[model samples]
Target chain A: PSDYMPEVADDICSLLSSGESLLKVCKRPGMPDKSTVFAWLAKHEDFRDKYAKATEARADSIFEEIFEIADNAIPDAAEVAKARLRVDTRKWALARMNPRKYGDKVTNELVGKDGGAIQIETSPMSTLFG
Target chain B: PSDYMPEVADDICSLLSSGESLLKVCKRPGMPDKSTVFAWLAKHEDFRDKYAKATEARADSIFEEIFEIADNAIPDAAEVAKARLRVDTRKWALARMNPRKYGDKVTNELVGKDGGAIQIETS
Candidate 1:
């Protein structure tokens, strides 16, 4: 049969595995948006492993981005806060999505524990007693 | 510049525009998963229109899928519910995502009505 399409599996995973985000390929050319590829995640079972590895790499890329902010040492008003804001946002995304490497076990377990709230924010009993 | 890969823009959208879901190409031997193509969407602005039209086509494809369920009239326990379930789910997605043609403007304006709930469910 005549094939109207070429193989794009490697091109995509290669980018992600190369530390490119699902979003990274968006800026270059030819690729569609992340949701479209997310559709790909729904479609292909075999490619899931490839995508996971790439996702892990992109997570590492976020770590390196955090690293970049750390060393940039460049400053302005609330500049340090800016880095914290950026890092925290990416940290939550990575920690939740790529939990195998970036997850916090304590936080993870507590959140998944039964139906009770973790109570880290407020301590009604403890604070009242104290 | 030397290119490491071939251009996949046409390949992906071509499928969608041809009434193929981003999912259609995934089962085939070639083409990456839809998210990778979605990354392509993040990468290129020029292709957005192409994708939009393709998205519209895919939405229509869902309509056609509903059409198929309509004719398939073959059935078992709650089989009609099966098609209803499928159509309703796809209807919500298309009505939201591809609102231009498949959208319900009344629902749209109400949802965007701000601050309070629409109360479509429950009395």
Candidate 2:
């Protein structure tokens, strides 16, 4: 998978091959950082983790957020609220930067003059609201 | 504009028409939230708002984040810090859910037993 490299735990991968969700393999205490784990999995092409190792809430949150953006944009009532939050957070972060790096006219312009070294964009706000 | 869907203010659009950065049109108060304004613009397709209503910081952050993710991936120094922050936030949030409702054995599954009501897949 181009999007994912499938670095799963062997037995877990076996379980998955036999049709199982990640929950079947993760029996740890608290949720571990799925992003790191998943990123590792992507690099290694394996997807197994110890029990109590999965961050169920984080994964679910991200999953629901992504699914909503992908499958239901207009119907998703929470996008605006979440967008507002992210926009607020983003603004707060930007506010910390030097205004001169961007346009002298409008602060919203995504420009950093020195080597043209900064840029970012928005995705649909669906990923954070659910 | 499938990507942005033109909804800027008339004056701002005109200013943008001439290629002036938004900072010129945004001469009002402290940064107004662009997400709300942008969403409003998306809905109305007009894109005009009052002065002093630009959340420059937020827009740029999204821009930088996107650009960083896009142009280069292997050499971004700040991604690890940022990713850690996001993952930590996510983990904290997910830790709040009831395991029984989701799955009993392993918690990483994106399946909810109730009506299979939940089928979530994280990216």
Candidate 3:
């Protein structure tokens, strides 16, 4: 934290929000290594919060990219997959950052068929013994 | 598709469900190339459905790996990053296969704090 500059945090957030991958952002010229950046994230609460928000913004940026690709279209399967892989990586990372906001919601079903809930009967051990 | 074998499709589904990468699965001994497999998916509806289910199974496998890593823990940040990368690649691939099942659901917030939905009076 001693050698860390305030401007670096701001720069990291800006780059992330603009859709740059975290790995790329950390490896930029004059930027710190990935481990150093992640250390800061672990040590500094405020920086971590900023990073999370930046991730959300990055997700939004990636979502826009997906839509753009879908609209313009490409014929080559490999090229299409490349674009899809890029979006998928970002989307996956974004979901990891905020599972509640990004993770899939799961629902439990107790009954099937019509609409009424299924019922189960349990007998007491004393009744069975008798 | 004329040369496509049911066994290949069955093997692909099994491998995918067991957490093998799609590229690796396509490249396995006696298996077809990536393009051919994808071609089959594009042409055959039944095969495509199987592939989707396989992808979902792969995602579940990766999710388990993530949890395992988190539980036992690794001291090296690089190692942790590698594990995360592995899970991320698979998770990303799975989400692409089924966005409705895996993609993040975005919600619209038309209102601000301390109020109901903000009404924009349009002239």
Candidate 4:
């Protein structure tokens, strides 16, 4: 496997067509350390080279941004969420990486019609309720 | 003038009196600071030593035996005081320093006639 993420992404795309978590592949046989996976994925140039315009999406960085939002934005979000904080913290933390589950519906609505029929509305239902 | 309280107290008291205040006494002369009278009287070892026990009766000592049973002698004095607390803090703070005014009444009731009335039956 290439030390670089683009090279790795190319290898992974070759290995598996669909994108999933790196943990699954990295765990196979003699897996690199989580640090190795993280460091490789953190290289923005390597990621942009492979994915063409997509910045590197290291899971740790994604989680870090998610946490920053959780700490700063989430407080206000929680004020709005107070009535809606029924979303359990463990569930929210677990679901944060896949923000499409919660925030995407709002973004998707703002983004007119993509190929997918995106509905934008607030209800008792979660952002997951597409 | 020296920003220090002692300097102000000295200047003010030097121009005042033991029995009076600056605002009252300095109606004519120039008084520099407050607390002058208090500092002056405080420094007067003669007046302080002489008036230590005479002009008025402030029998302000713990008036009870080693086995005391006065205002502070209530078996549940502290708990009793809890029920008696009014949170009108301003009046309460003013009155607290003169605890004897309120407590002396209770003490007299408990101490009956000093040497003989302590035949208290516990509840």
Task: Evaluate all candidate structures by whole-model CA lDDT and list the values in order.
Answer: 0.55, 0.35, 0.63, 0.34
Q: Taking the tens digit of each residue's C-alpha lDDT, what string does model 3 give over B13-115?
A: 8788666777988666888888888788788899988888777766655543443443233434555455556656656665675666566654443332233
Q: For residues A1-130, what per-residue lDDT tens digits would candidate 2 score against the true structure?
A: 1243333344444333322345534543432344544655656522434322233222222322331222222222354345434434433332233222211121123333232533333345556655
* lDDT by residue for model 3 (A1-130), tens: 3356668988989997986665566557888765466556646888988877887887677656667755654555544444444445545555655656765555333342243333345655865565
- Poorest lDDT segment (10 consecutive residues) of candidate 2 chain A: A98-107
DockQ of 4: 0.00
- For model 4, how does the per-residue alpha-carbon lDDT over A51-112 read when each residue is reduced to its tens digit? 32221233233344444434543344223232122112212222332333332232111212
TM, every model: 0.39, 0.18, 0.45, 0.20
TM value for model 2: 0.18
RMSD of each: 21.8, 26.7, 17.7, 36.3
lDDT by residue (tens digit), candidate 1, B1-123: 112123566666777677765445655666665455545555567776777777677777777777786568346434444444444445544653365566543311222124333223221
Which candidate achieves the best DockQ against the true structure?
3
Model 4 per-residue lDDT tens digits across residues B3-112? 33444344343332222333655444544333544455477665443333211111111110100111122224353233223212222332342343311111122232
Residue-level lDDT for A104 in candidate 1? 43
Scanning candidate 2 chain B in windows of ten residues, the lowest lDDT window is B95-104
Question: What does candidate 1 score on TM?
Answer: 0.39
Off by more than 4 A, model 1: A1-130, B1-7, B105-123
Q: Candidates' DockQ values?
A: 0.01, 0.02, 0.04, 0.00
Sort candidate 3 into its docking category. incorrect
Instruction: State how far residue B2 of model 4 sits from its true place (Å).
Output: 46
